[PDB]
Structure 1
Amino acid sequence: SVGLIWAQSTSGVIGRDGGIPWRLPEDLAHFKRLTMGHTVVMGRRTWDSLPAAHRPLPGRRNVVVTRQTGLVAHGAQVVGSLEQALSPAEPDAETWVIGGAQIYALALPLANRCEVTEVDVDLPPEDEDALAPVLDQTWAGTSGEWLVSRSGLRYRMHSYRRL
């Protein structure tokens, strides 16, 4: 199983200024619960965005996709394409593509599941924003209820699978 997992504003923003432009603890907990013990595949810019105590992401096999063949990434496995990342020498029952926008676009045709957090935060897109992939008619999904975070934002989780 190859899955994508992301959190987006309702406007589709996933990233700004090298980070994520909201604070949603319940989404971090969801992300940890879904990914712990599994492989997490990410683009190099997402690797560089990880906060210090989470670079590498603890308890997960971290795989970083870069064209920089000689790149040192302590705590992660460096590979040269998304296809390499999805062709491990040691297979994993679950592989999660964890971003960013560039890598999601390449991974979506190869994936069978998407786990999406929708965040009701008003962020009109700015020119350098990273944006979420869009799910077309080849995907179908289910939505959780709208919830309110202890930190204030409304949010909800969606689970999509390839038809």
Structure 2
Amino acid sequence: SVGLIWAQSTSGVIGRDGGIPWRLPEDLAHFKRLTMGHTVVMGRRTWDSLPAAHRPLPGRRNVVVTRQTGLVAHGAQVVGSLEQALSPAEPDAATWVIGGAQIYALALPLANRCEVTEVDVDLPPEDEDALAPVLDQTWAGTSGEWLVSRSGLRYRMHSYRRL
């Protein structure tokens, strides 16, 4: 099982300026609950975007997809392709692809599940933004109710499974 997990604004922005242009603690908790104890696969930009307190992501096997020989920032296992990231895999569990846009595009054809957090923040896309992948007719989804964060932002979760 290969799952994509991401958070996006309603407009479909996932990234800006090498980071994420909102703060939503409830989504961080959701992300940790779904990924704890599992392998997480990310693109190298996302690895370099992690604040030092969160790099590597604790309690997870951190796999970084890069074309470079290796990385200056410690704690990752580097691989040269998504296929190398995904095999061998943890039994009875999902391997989670955790971004960013380039790595989501690589993984989308291989994925069985998507776990999306939608954040109701008004973020018209800007020219260098990373955008969420668009899902096609091979996905069936369900959506949770709108929730209110302690910061006042509304958010909700969507879950998709391959037909």
Structures share fold, TM-score greater than 0.5: yes
- Indicate conservation of the 8 Å contact 2:11/2:123, yes or no: yes
What is the rounded CA distance, in whole Å, between the counterparts of 2:103 and 2:24 in structure 1?
Answer: 23
What is the rounded CA distance, in whole Å, between the counterparts of 2:72 and 2:91 in structure 1?
Answer: 23
- Give the secondary-structure state (helix, strand or coil) at the position aligned to 2:99: coil
Give 2:152's aligned residue.
152
Over residues 74-95 of structure 1, what are the superposed CA-to-partner deviations in whole Å (9 max), with x where a residue is unaligned?
A: 2110000111101137767320
- Indicate conservation of the 8 Å contact 2:4/2:98, yes or no: yes
- Indicate conservation of the 8 Å contact 2:38/2:90, yes or no: no
Change (3 A) 1:80 1:91: farther
- Give the secondary-structure state (helix, strand or coil) at the position aligned to 2:152: coil
CA RMSD between the two structures: 1.3
What is the rounded CA distance, in whole Å, between the counterparts of 1:67 and 1:25 in structure 2?
Answer: 32
Where do 5+ consecutive residues of structure 1 fail to align?
Answer: none
Range 66-75 or range 143-152, more displaced: 66-75
Over residues 42-79 of structure 1, what are the superposed CA-to-partner deviations in whole Å (9 max), with x where a residue is unaligned?
A: 00000001111100000000000000023344211000
- Give the secondary-structure state (helix, strand or coil) at the position aligned to 2:135: coil
Report the TM-score, using the length of structure 1 for normalisation.
0.96
Percent identical across equivalent pairs? 99
Q: Give the Å deviation of 1:2.
A: 0.4
- Give the secondary-structure state (helix, strand or coil) at the position aligned to 1:29: helix
Aligned length: 163
Change (3 A) 1:89 1:148: closer
Over residues 14-64 of structure 1, what are the superposed CA-to-partner deviations in whole Å (9 max), with x where a residue is unaligned?
A: 000111000101000000000000000000000001111100000000000
- Indicate conservation of the 8 Å contact 2:89/2:95, yes or no: no
- Indicate conservation of the 8 Å contact 1:38/1:92, yes or no: no
Change (3 A) 1:111 1:90: closer
Where do 5+ consecutive residues of structure 2 fail to align?
Answer: none
- Give the secondary-structure state (helix, strand or coil) at the position aligned to 1:141: strand
Change (3 A) 1:18 1:146: same
Over residues 67-124 of structure 1, what are the superposed CA-to-partner deviations in whole Å (9 max), with x where a residue is unaligned?
A: 0023344211000011110113776732000000000011011000000000000011
